[PDB]
């Protein structure tokens, strides 16, 4: 009898998915790591050479975390002493290696405790942030030029984001943007002077006698937000003037009237930059298009080139206004925007005309614009077979919009329905990355003729291993509720028999723009639960879910903890109606927003669920950050939406927890969803005399991602689910 | 059939022990609160009068927490707006009511947020501490005289203790000592300038958007300690025009050479004060005897009047050097000290003579000196029947030490083997309080011929209630380890059958000078476990336990987490071999030091225990306070005892928990045993891949004593023990 996919298989990564991570260095070459060696590949022929031997840094004295080759291929930036901070941020030591001289640069070194470093996009200039100030090095062995003198720990951030901008706005620590040829360096400055601090203990190693108090400027819903300014400096002037001026680009008057955010920075040309600003009430955004004025040395943003993007039904963008993709001359751009029917499509703008032209349309959505050439625009969408959980690459002819080719749809339709893509520097080649429903498949293609050059990684080694395992299957389908299709997925036990009643676990995210029903192949906890424990693991995309238009996505506008919660309860009722579910053994679990939804469901008094697990849940919207929370909730004030902020807490439902078995889990060093959120849930349960199970994870953050904690959490949860379902 | 004593009975206090809390006001009368009225009783006859009617403050407008009648009976101090701080500390507002003119005093009121207040021992003067400074009121309606001007929150404490002195030295917030007739006011000043802060989050009500960080000067083992100064002010020479002069009494040279503590303050006469000082290495203490010099207005401590108390086997005193009991003229005193055999007995000292004479001797110990007259000294000891867990009142004739009379031994030997006593002002009367093995019994006695005047409270109502309940029994006995007798107790289920095998729970404290095997009657969680669940609840006093001499008590000197842990394992091993114990179902639990011992036992690899629960455990001695830890452990330095501090952690034993079921519980706002201690245990268990159960209690302190958290913790622990023992 074939073995099943066990918890130890999941925890020890016995069945490993192979990836094919390449780094394009030009229009026809990419770097790839094979046995610690960095190889350089010719995309056209597939032949390779050793770019940098695995022995090169044996006597370096430090474990090299990562590398970055300069665009001109003359130098390599070596990253070591990697100290992780938030989701994207970290600090590190850096050394530069001269590839021609085959020697390490020992003079004018990048200082220790550097926050961020980036090469210019052409050549080998460097911009780095140290002690919250910006520095530029024209040459790697030459002294740096200081750009800002205002940097102040937890107060003034130059060229790096504060906590909330990193997590919720830029999805990056960097707040610097080199112009295309590296002449200009644009950057943002954040001022957190009056932003309140979240404070929590950090225990550290057992040797630390007194716990440390971590203090982070973090605006919770309705609190004082950071303020922002934007500047551009001419880096070519640095060696000629003692102190090059950083020219400020001010936000438009429509933004200056109140609290706002800088939400996008995109260079259009060597002398034209676009900025998108967003009001604190995130249903109004403005794009400014600013030109360098050679005579005054200033940047001017013509009101005739200003573009407004607003929403009457919700917020702007999926998580923020989309980025523009400029034509070469910078006179027009393409941008994903919500059309009249509420579907996200590509609109084509002239920089000085306010009405744009939709180039795509239909009851499906464009996910992202991937590449733009003089002849074609390449994008990913879920158009294929009307499956919102599928992803394919398309090519649209710019001279004729009726000419739209699906590049990936028919390559392997049974195996591959979810693609991402990586184009070479001037889109001469593309790597397709198929991630499901079959095993991931990595392929290389030439853009000149859309022909498949070769298979880079087909996961044949894993396919051979999986043949000896009783793997679960995955069903992706939909149910019709109020004449609307709502998609779901089920991870089904091997030898699934519709005449048997199986215990069911509802795996929840359900946040705005979430998508838990898709065609991706995964080897995860659900794989073990279905394979070894014979539990069906189901997910459902209800109201508030993404990629299906604004009628569905904006259904929870100003009303988090309502329809998306009710729809999970209804999903379990619908799954019961299917006949293969044991109604006495329905559980629910989720992490982060999924933990908030799980807790709201367990506290609903629905009687549908026996038990559930909430990991790092939000419990009260006033505890979560301003940028995310307010996007959907507005402000927690009597004039705005306070009544709903107060009505949508987990704590108010404490009495209903007497009806369920609950396991509450949270990392003590969670900088994102503060441990406070679970500490308030537990106190409310204690106050009404509800027994429940709890687990804190010392010094673990939002991901509970350390090797040991990850294994511990999944082991603890597996015992809990098995006990709930009376499984030995 | 009759009911058992249930978990709800314990949690809802269905069966209440009645008390008889009186307050002696003279040599012949006492105050007693009855039906919210305050009565005054004549001790000779038992007749009473209403002192204060419960209706007097019906229009007060504030809920009165407590009352304090001035020694002359003219005024009543009304305590309200009580806000608890640590174990003894709190702030409150105060009003004074004139009992003669039947009016509240509205002039010169004691301020709000007052930290401590006390009447003089005679008359009606008041001394109070507000904002860390001392104030004196000669008359309740008159303006206060400010005594100190140096008081500073968390830095300078005048007349109040800091965290460590409150918890570990004085067992009180007060650091004020009035002279016998109220002429002088002695006080200590603590300086915490360089003492590190323990910091932890406090979540508060759900309405608090950002958690607060509590910061308390708290010296962990080996850290910088507070410094102390001692002063005496004459309250009879205070001026409205001039600032009060405080006369400092400096510590002897033997103390000033290094870190030290003030550990006792005891007035001998109107003009003589005794002070005891302890070195930071707590095996050397010095008493100074200081006399007021009318001529110079100074306090002089003659070197010929110094008394050294040292220990070669351990620390000095049970938890600190004992208090002296001075004679009427103050020329001699009686003090409990460890004799040459290591047994604590009463020694008689002359103020100017080095050698003291022991007035009691034997293989038993004096617990406390209770009263002293020119003819007799009254004391509590465990002499009777050689039972260290029993307590009786004795008197010793001062003119003939061979004449020792037991005053409580024979009153009711079957019901009463554990007494405490309260004597009237000049020991003319005494109240005996019997607390077991039977129901508590309160009686009143006259000293002249030791007449048993009357029964004050006999708990006959509770006896009637308990007749309809299947109550457990208690067995108190001993086992012999290495020719030494060590006592244990077992709470046995009702209808105990020695032919049946019962699961056993070992209830542990086991700290230095602990005593868990005694004759006290208790209605607690163990009562329910035995009565309803049929579990034997055992406790054992092994090496390090108290009241049995230093050979046993000092066995753990410099070696915490050694013999006291081994001895708990040995006792359970011995109990496991008894025919009435199920060796497959032995559990262990404890709180605080008991949580440390439980965890050390569970991590020992003994294999004796199936499961256990640690509540607020110490996990590493370097995390606990200096005063308690160093008393037993010395300093955590390589030259002193660092190796043993490092070898005695729970964390080092994490791998051994693989074979046990462990439940770890801790309050997040524990200012005493910081949450950090359990946070380090859980991280060590996660690091070795050991599954365990956990529960944090939001905002609960060391006591986890709020009504809802108390019910929740005992509910959660009951489920855990029942699951461990396969009990439905
Ligand atoms: C409170 C909120 C929110 C919402 N959120 C967002 N937002 C946008 C980005 C910035 C973020 N601050 C807010 N991205 C989200 C979510 C969300 O809750 N999940 C669920 C989830 N599930 C699992 C198993 C997780 C496992 C480990 C760590 C996090 C996990 N999180 C999620 N899964 C994939 C993406 N994301
Ligand atoms: C860490 C340490 C120590 C030692 N400690 C001391 N010391 C002397 C006084 C000052 C204190 N800081 C140190 N008195 C102690 C202990 C101790 O651990 N217990 C056990 C225990 N049990 C139960 C059910 C408890 C229930 C709630 C709260 C505390 C509990 N504590 C104990 N019981 C009665 C007295 N005491
Ligand atoms: C991939 O193969 C091609 C063809 O062999 C290499 O192209 C160059 O071809 C010239 C002939 O004019 C040879 O002299 C060289 O060996 C090649 N140039 C360089 C700069 O290496 C090509 O370089 C190969 N690429 C890799 C990454 O190995
Ligand atoms: C960051 O923002 C703070 C205000 O939150 C600015 O601080 C003020 O600076 C002015 C000088 O122009 C002072 O008069 C005020 O006393 C300051 N206010 C506070 C609340 O500190 C600060 O100047 C800004 N810093 C930068 C570099 O923009
Ligand atoms: C470079 O120029 C900047 C911009 O004028 C200087 O920054 C000013 O510095 C002084 C204090 O020394 C203050 O008057 C201003 O508030 C600063 N403005 C900003 C935007 O920082 C900076 O000090 C100059 N550097 C050198 C080396 O002269
Ligand atoms: C990259 O772009 C910048 C901006 O267009 C170029 O700098 C300009 O060069 C032109 C000549 O072609 C002059 O008219 C201007 O004085 C320059 N402007 C500034 C602001 O420096 C720059 O030459 C380009 N760099 C490279 C290496 O091609
Ligand atoms: C104790 O606090 C109370 C309340 O803050 C003070 O009592 C009066 O209280 C009213 C409102 O309850 C206020 O308008 C006044 O400021 C108070 N004044 C007087 C003269 O009573 C009170 O003063 C405080 N007690 C002391 C002794 O300072
Ligand atoms: C309490 O004791 C103090 C100190 O012995 C007494 O004060 C002394 O009283 C006599 C008067 O009979 C004077 O000769 C001394 O000068 C006083 N000494 C000081 C230090 O003030 C006082 O008699 C007693 N007070 C009460 C109220 O009984
Ligand atoms: C008080 O206890 C200390 C620590 O045990 C005793 O210290 C001595 O000094 C160190 C310990 O850190 C060792 O070098 C010696 O072995 C100890 N000296 C001896 C045993 O003579 C100190 O002696 C104790 N004091 C008393 C009065 O017994
Ligand atoms: C980084 O720190 C180390 C040791 O603390 C030092 O030897 C080295 O010079 C530092 N590097 C730079 C670039 O300052
Ligand atoms: C933005 O949202 C607020 C709150 O719903 C609303 O009052 C305002 O009219 C909105 N703007 C648009 C363009 O709908
Ligand atoms: C008790 O009775 C005596 C007389 O027998 C009386 O003088 C005394 O004041 C009474 N005491 C109380 C407290 O009522
Ligand atoms: C408290 O102690 C510090 C040294 O830690 C000293 O500088 C300061 O003067 C002291 N304050 C008082 C009032 O004694
Ligand atoms: C008393 O002492 C304080 C603090 O030193 C001072 O500020 C105040 O003026 C003094 N009062 C008199 C009457 O000397
Ligand atoms: Na009697």
JSON list of N, CA and C in Angstrom, two decimals, chain A residues 226-255:
[
{"chain": "A", "resi": 226, "resn": "UNK", "atom": "N", "xyz": [1.92, 59.27, 9.40]},
{"chain": "A", "resi": 226, "resn": "UNK", "atom": "CA", "xyz": [3.14, 59.96, 8.95]},
{"chain": "A", "resi": 226, "resn": "UNK", "atom": "C", "xyz": [2.77, 60.96, 7.85]},
{"chain": "A", "resi": 227, "resn": "UNK", "atom": "N", "xyz": [3.59, 62.01, 7.69]},
{"chain": "A", "resi": 227, "resn": "UNK", "atom": "CA", "xyz": [3.44, 62.96, 6.59]},
{"chain": "A", "resi": 227, "resn": "UNK", "atom": "C", "xyz": [4.55, 62.62, 5.63]},
{"chain": "A", "resi": 228, "resn": "UNK", "atom": "N", "xyz": [4.43, 63.09, 4.39]},
{"chain": "A", "resi": 228, "resn": "UNK", "atom": "CA", "xyz": [5.39, 62.70, 3.36]},
{"chain": "A", "resi": 228, "resn": "UNK", "atom": "C", "xyz": [5.76, 63.88, 2.48]},
{"chain": "A", "resi": 229, "resn": "UNK", "atom": "N", "xyz": [7.00, 63.88, 2.02]},
{"chain": "A", "resi": 229, "resn": "UNK", "atom": "CA", "xyz": [7.48, 64.88, 1.03]},
{"chain": "A", "resi": 229, "resn": "UNK", "atom": "C", "xyz": [8.24, 64.11, -0.02]},
{"chain": "A", "resi": 230, "resn": "UNK", "atom": "N", "xyz": [8.35, 64.69, -1.21]},
{"chain": "A", "resi": 230, "resn": "UNK", "atom": "CA", "xyz": [8.99, 64.05, -2.35]},
{"chain": "A", "resi": 230, "resn": "UNK", "atom": "C", "xyz": [10.01, 65.00, -2.93]},
{"chain": "A", "resi": 231, "resn": "UNK", "atom": "N", "xyz": [11.20, 64.46, -3.24]},
{"chain": "A", "resi": 231, "resn": "UNK", "atom": "CA", "xyz": [12.33, 65.25, -3.75]},
{"chain": "A", "resi": 231, "resn": "UNK", "atom": "C", "xyz": [13.03, 64.57, -4.92]},
{"chain": "A", "resi": 232, "resn": "UNK", "atom": "N", "xyz": [13.71, 65.36, -5.75]},
{"chain": "A", "resi": 232, "resn": "UNK", "atom": "CA", "xyz": [14.52, 64.84, -6.85]},
{"chain": "A", "resi": 232, "resn": "UNK", "atom": "C", "xyz": [15.87, 65.58, -6.80]},
{"chain": "A", "resi": 233, "resn": "UNK", "atom": "N", "xyz": [16.97, 64.81, -6.85]},
{"chain": "A", "resi": 233, "resn": "UNK", "atom": "CA", "xyz": [18.33, 65.37, -6.86]},
{"chain": "A", "resi": 233, "resn": "UNK", "atom": "C", "xyz": [19.04, 64.95, -8.15]},
{"chain": "A", "resi": 234, "resn": "UNK", "atom": "N", "xyz": [19.81, 65.87, -8.75]},
{"chain": "A", "resi": 234, "resn": "UNK", "atom": "CA", "xyz": [20.59, 65.60, -9.95]},
{"chain": "A", "resi": 234, "resn": "UNK", "atom": "C", "xyz": [21.94, 64.99, -9.49]},
{"chain": "A", "resi": 235, "resn": "UNK", "atom": "N", "xyz": [22.09, 63.68, -9.62]},
{"chain": "A", "resi": 235, "resn": "UNK", "atom": "CA", "xyz": [23.33, 62.99, -9.16]},
{"chain": "A", "resi": 235, "resn": "UNK", "atom": "C", "xyz": [24.56, 63.32, -10.02]},
{"chain": "A", "resi": 236, "resn": "UNK", "atom": "N", "xyz": [24.33, 63.77, -11.27]},
{"chain": "A", "resi": 236, "resn": "UNK", "atom": "CA", "xyz": [25.41, 64.17, -12.16]},
{"chain": "A", "resi": 236, "resn": "UNK", "atom": "C", "xyz": [26.06, 65.48, -11.72]},
{"chain": "A", "resi": 237, "resn": "UNK", "atom": "N", "xyz": [25.39, 66.24, -10.83]},
{"chain": "A", "resi": 237, "resn": "UNK", "atom": "CA", "xyz": [25.91, 67.53, -10.34]},
{"chain": "A", "resi": 237, "resn": "UNK", "atom": "C", "xyz": [26.76, 67.34, -9.07]},
{"chain": "A", "resi": 238, "resn": "UNK", "atom": "N", "xyz": [26.74, 66.15, -8.47]},
{"chain": "A", "resi": 238, "resn": "UNK", "atom": "CA", "xyz": [27.39, 65.91, -7.18]},
{"chain": "A", "resi": 238, "resn": "UNK", "atom": "C", "xyz": [28.87, 66.23, -7.11]},
{"chain": "A", "resi": 239, "resn": "UNK", "atom": "N", "xyz": [29.64, 65.83, -8.13]},
{"chain": "A", "resi": 239, "resn": "UNK", "atom": "CA", "xyz": [31.08, 66.07, -8.13]},
{"chain": "A", "resi": 239, "resn": "UNK", "atom": "C", "xyz": [31.45, 67.51, -8.49]},
{"chain": "A", "resi": 240, "resn": "UNK", "atom": "N", "xyz": [30.44, 68.36, -8.84]},
{"chain": "A", "resi": 240, "resn": "UNK", "atom": "CA", "xyz": [30.63, 69.76, -9.28]},
{"chain": "A", "resi": 240, "resn": "UNK", "atom": "C", "xyz": [30.19, 70.82, -8.27]},
{"chain": "A", "resi": 241, "resn": "UNK", "atom": "N", "xyz": [29.30, 70.45, -7.35]},
{"chain": "A", "resi": 241, "resn": "UNK", "atom": "CA", "xyz": [28.78, 71.41, -6.36]},
{"chain": "A", "resi": 241, "resn": "UNK", "atom": "C", "xyz": [28.95, 70.85, -4.95]},
{"chain": "A", "resi": 242, "resn": "UNK", "atom": "N", "xyz": [29.15, 71.72, -3.95]},
{"chain": "A", "resi": 242, "resn": "UNK", "atom": "CA", "xyz": [29.41, 71.20, -2.60]},
{"chain": "A", "resi": 242, "resn": "UNK", "atom": "C", "xyz": [28.24, 70.47, -1.99]},
{"chain": "A", "resi": 243, "resn": "UNK", "atom": "N", "xyz": [27.04, 70.95, -2.28]},
{"chain": "A", "resi": 243, "resn": "UNK", "atom": "CA", "xyz": [25.83, 70.40, -1.70]},
{"chain": "A", "resi": 243, "resn": "UNK", "atom": "C", "xyz": [24.67, 70.51, -2.69]},
{"chain": "A", "resi": 244, "resn": "UNK", "atom": "N", "xyz": [24.54, 69.51, -3.57]},
{"chain": "A", "resi": 244, "resn": "UNK", "atom": "CA", "xyz": [23.48, 69.46, -4.60]},
{"chain": "A", "resi": 244, "resn": "UNK", "atom": "C", "xyz": [22.09, 69.58, -3.99]},
{"chain": "A", "resi": 245, "resn": "UNK", "atom": "N", "xyz": [21.26, 70.44, -4.59]},
{"chain": "A", "resi": 245, "resn": "UNK", "atom": "CA", "xyz": [19.93, 70.72, -4.05]},
{"chain": "A", "resi": 245, "resn": "UNK", "atom": "C", "xyz": [18.95, 69.61, -4.37]},
{"chain": "A", "resi": 246, "resn": "UNK", "atom": "N", "xyz": [18.18, 69.19, -3.36]},
{"chain": "A", "resi": 246, "resn": "UNK", "atom": "CA", "xyz": [17.11, 68.24, -3.60]},
{"chain": "A", "resi": 246, "resn": "UNK", "atom": "C", "xyz": [15.89, 69.12, -3.88]},
{"chain": "A", "resi": 247, "resn": "UNK", "atom": "N", "xyz": [15.35, 69.01, -5.09]},
{"chain": "A", "resi": 247, "resn": "UNK", "atom": "CA", "xyz": [14.19, 69.82, -5.50]},
{"chain": "A", "resi": 247, "resn": "UNK", "atom": "C", "xyz": [12.93, 69.11, -5.05]},
{"chain": "A", "resi": 248, "resn": "UNK", "atom": "N", "xyz": [12.09, 69.82, -4.28]},
{"chain": "A", "resi": 248, "resn": "UNK", "atom": "CA", "xyz": [10.85, 69.24, -3.83]},
{"chain": "A", "resi": 248, "resn": "UNK", "atom": "C", "xyz": [9.78, 69.32, -4.91]},
{"chain": "A", "resi": 249, "resn": "UNK", "atom": "N", "xyz": [8.99, 68.25, -5.02]},
{"chain": "A", "resi": 249, "resn": "UNK", "atom": "CA", "xyz": [7.79, 68.22, -5.84]},
{"chain": "A", "resi": 249, "resn": "UNK", "atom": "C", "xyz": [6.64, 68.15, -4.84]},
{"chain": "A", "resi": 250, "resn": "UNK", "atom": "N", "xyz": [5.86, 69.23, -4.74]},
{"chain": "A", "resi": 250, "resn": "UNK", "atom": "CA", "xyz": [4.77, 69.22, -3.77]},
{"chain": "A", "resi": 250, "resn": "UNK", "atom": "C", "xyz": [3.53, 68.51, -4.31]},
{"chain": "A", "resi": 251, "resn": "UNK", "atom": "N", "xyz": [2.75, 67.95, -3.40]},
{"chain": "A", "resi": 251, "resn": "UNK", "atom": "CA", "xyz": [1.49, 67.27, -3.69]},
{"chain": "A", "resi": 251, "resn": "UNK", "atom": "C", "xyz": [0.49, 68.32, -4.24]},
{"chain": "A", "resi": 252, "resn": "UNK", "atom": "N", "xyz": [-0.48, 67.94, -5.10]},
{"chain": "A", "resi": 252, "resn": "UNK", "atom": "CA", "xyz": [-1.45, 68.94, -5.59]},
{"chain": "A", "resi": 252, "resn": "UNK", "atom": "C", "xyz": [-2.33, 69.50, -4.47]},
{"chain": "A", "resi": 253, "resn": "UNK", "atom": "N", "xyz": [-2.94, 70.70, -4.68]},
{"chain": "A", "resi": 253, "resn": "UNK", "atom": "CA", "xyz": [-3.82, 71.31, -3.67]},
{"chain": "A", "resi": 253, "resn": "UNK", "atom": "C", "xyz": [-4.97, 70.39, -3.22]},
{"chain": "A", "resi": 254, "resn": "UNK", "atom": "N", "xyz": [-5.51, 69.56, -4.14]},
{"chain": "A", "resi": 254, "resn": "UNK", "atom": "CA", "xyz": [-6.60, 68.62, -3.84]},
{"chain": "A", "resi": 254, "resn": "UNK", "atom": "C", "xyz": [-6.19, 67.58, -2.78]},
{"chain": "A", "resi": 255, "resn": "UNK", "atom": "N", "xyz": [-4.88, 67.36, -2.64]},
{"chain": "A", "resi": 255, "resn": "UNK", "atom": "CA", "xyz": [-4.33, 66.45, -1.63]},
{"chain": "A", "resi": 255, "resn": "UNK", "atom": "C", "xyz": [-3.95, 67.22, -0.35]}
]
